[PDB]
Each structure stands twice: as C-alpha cells, then as structure tokens.
C-alpha cells in the first residue's frame, strides 16, 4: 500500500465537506505513486459512486495498486507493434499506439510525454517501459 499519512494529508487538503470526487481520487492516487486506469475509475463509480469519504478513497486507492504490473507484459505489448523487430519504435509508431489503442492519450498528454521521455525516432520501448514503471 501507499504511504498512509501522505494519503490522509492529500485527501484532507483536496476534500470539500470531507469528500473528494473520483476525478480527484484519480489525481491523488497518481500523486501517491499509483497508476489507476480510467476503467478503474468507472468500475469504482459503478460500485461506490463518484463522491468518496476517506474510507472509500482508501478503498479506491486499494483497487489502483495493480501489483500484477510487470515490465515484461508492458515491453511485449509494444513489441507486438514492432513489425520488423527492430527493438525500437519510431515517434510515429509510439504516437499511433498510445493515441489510438487502450485508453488513448490526448495530444496534450502525448506532446508532454514526448518532450520529457522521448529522445529520437528510435525509442527503446524496453527502457521506456522501465522508466514508466519506476
């Protein structure tokens, strides 16, 4: 689990009337070091609504831990699109994957991502996935 007093501090600072929206719960979870998906958000909303007291926030953070995350599963997801098995993907290829499939990045998100974490037209997706899991 995340760091409990940080979880409490961030919730209390974001809360209004002792509650935070699931939208804010998503942000705080990320700040706490987790990677909730939008599917996690929708799943939780259908289960517990979109306005969380601290107990329900703790539970949401719980469902967002994804201990099953593994570098090999991520690396091989990108490898699938490495048609010619180069061991890298171009900016185009990375962009097309990340903005078309799954829970697609917005151009805002992708442009920020590319600025910091991309380095060329030969993105080593193994090392990129390592960085993302860090």
């Amino acid at each position: 689990m995340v760091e409990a007093d940080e979880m409490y501090a961030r919730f209390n600072a974001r809360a209004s009337g002792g509650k935070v929206s699931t939208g804010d719960a998503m942000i705080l979870a990320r700040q706490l070091g987790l990677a909730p998906s939008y599917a996690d958000k929708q799943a939780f909303e259908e289960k517990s609504g979109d306005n969380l007291d601290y107990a329900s926030f703790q539970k949401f953070v719980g469902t967002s831990t994804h201990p099953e995350d593994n570098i090999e599963d991520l690396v091989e997801a990108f490898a699938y699109f490495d048609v010619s098995k180069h061991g890298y993907l171009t900016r185009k290829q990375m962009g097309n994957i990340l903005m078309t499939y799954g829970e697609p990045l917005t151009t805002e998100e992708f442009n920020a991502l590319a600025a910091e974490y991309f380095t060329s037209d030969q993105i080593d997706y193994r090392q990129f996935c390592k960085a993302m899991l860090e």
């Binding site: 939208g23 998503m26 942000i27 990320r30 700040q31 070091g33 987790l34 990677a35 909730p36 998906s37 939008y38 599917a39 994804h66 995350d69 599963d73 991520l74 091989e76 997801a77 990108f78 699938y80 994957i97 990340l98 078309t100 499939y101 799954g102 829970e103 697609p104 990045l105 917005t106 805002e108 998100e109 920020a112 991502l113 974490y117 996935c129 960085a131 993302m132 899991l133």
Partner: peptide, 30 residues
C-alpha cells in the same frame, strides 16, 4: 490481448504526467 497492457502503460504514463496538468478526467476507450 495486448490492449490491457497498453492501458497499464498509459496509466503509468499518466502517473508520471500528474504534475503536468494535462490529463483529462475521462477518456473514451478504444
């Protein structure tokens, strides 16, 4: 069967962009 892991990659991307104020509240999945 790769899509669930693309989503995990995208979730971890968003985790690292949290201070960038760029991520939407909702995303239309594909």
């Amino acid at each position: 069967k790769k899509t669930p892991f693309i989503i995990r990659a995208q979730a971890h991307i968003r985790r690292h962009l949290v201070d960038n104020n760029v991520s939407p509240a909702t995303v239309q999945p594909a």
